[PDB]
């Protein structure tokens, strides 16, 4: 769902620009997926 | 009431009922005179000033350049800083410097002494200042070709009348080189030494 | 395309400028080949097109090895430092990087040397002028008619102005042309003049 | 005269250098993304709080 979030703030994209905004929101979306291995912890296939 | 200093060029206009004498000389001045009507002084009087702007310089005329191609509308004058000032007779306004040359990149080492356009080609125009001669379009502020570098000065430069594509410079050295660009641009045609001493001006028949 | 637009007009003329049109020319005919792009359109998936890469690779070697051949033969023909300098900024931007640019480098060493024998033949000429114009001698290194010692002055500047037109332009050169021991001699030549 | 064109582009282009590099211009780069990653961080927590 988290992920799914991050999908929306792609898939909504109607392929205009994006890339000179979406560097710069790659960084706080790679952020937040290294929070959710912690949160979880019982997590299986975390390496898959 | 006639110019300070010594006459630089004299040079009459054909383009009159009657001969009318124009005058470039050392005091940043030029004067077109009548001869029928010499009067008092020179009719039209015109200061060489340089730059324009707010920074007003007078600089000495060292050569004057006309030609019936051109016309009596357009005055080539060559200052002793190594610039190039085309003065425009007008009936509305006494004088007008239309045209600077080489203000930034064609300014000559030292004083231009011969400016001249070839007979064939009233356009292309070559002036003879310092150690080499350059040739400059009626509408370049630079110059078109820059040809080599001479042996102390180019005291005088004169296109041929029947032929455009051959020039004749005459040094200081009292050596004269011929320059034909019809078949190689590169290097001097021939050279011929005149005589020991060093040749003031050359002049070729029409 | 910017190749195409060049007008150098030095020296020699026309068949330097057919050559060069041909070879704009050779780069249109490759576009037309690459330029219909059947299928490709740079699909990750497809190899196709990195094939065609390849036979385009070649193809502007061989544009870029003519412009190295043409250009040599420019820099030769003018014979002049102003000259030769003057056709380096007409392809100041159309260098190839590597394949241009190597020949580059044997082009600064030549124009160098000629700026060489123009320091000489100045100072050569200086040593005989000074002479003439300290006796106030007659046929004398100053223009026409002018003050002597204000001539002096006037003389000295064009003789400077001369020597300094090519510095500018020096400076201008890069790949470390400065490191270059025979850039610095010639330097060294200068400032003692 | 196509070297004029070329001498003007020159000049153009110690302009554009200096007009789009500016001193530190990373810097504020940088506080711009440090303050996207804070907003982030605390949309994860109200994320992870739902279930």
Redesign the interface.
Known sequence: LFTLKDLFSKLQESQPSDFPTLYELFIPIMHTILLIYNKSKTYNQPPR | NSHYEPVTHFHWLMSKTGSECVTTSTDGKVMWWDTRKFEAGPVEKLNIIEGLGENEEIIGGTALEYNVEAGPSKFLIGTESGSILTANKKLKKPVEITTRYGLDQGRHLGPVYSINRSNQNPKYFLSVGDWSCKIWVEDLKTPIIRTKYHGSYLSDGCWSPTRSGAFFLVRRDGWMDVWDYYYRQNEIAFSHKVSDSPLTCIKINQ | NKLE???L????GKTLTESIAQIFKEFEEAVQAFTSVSYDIMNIAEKKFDDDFYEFRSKIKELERRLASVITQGFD????I??RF?LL??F??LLTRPIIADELEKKHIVLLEMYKQ?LK?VQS?FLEGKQFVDSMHE?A?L???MPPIAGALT?CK??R??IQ?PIEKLAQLGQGITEREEYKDVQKLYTSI | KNLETIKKQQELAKRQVQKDMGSQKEKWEKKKLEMIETAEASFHENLAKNP
């Open positions: 637009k060049i007008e007009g030095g020296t020699k023909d003018y014979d002049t102003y000259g003057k900024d007409n100041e931007g123009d033949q000429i046929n290194p223009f026409l008619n003389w064009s003789l102005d001369r037109e």
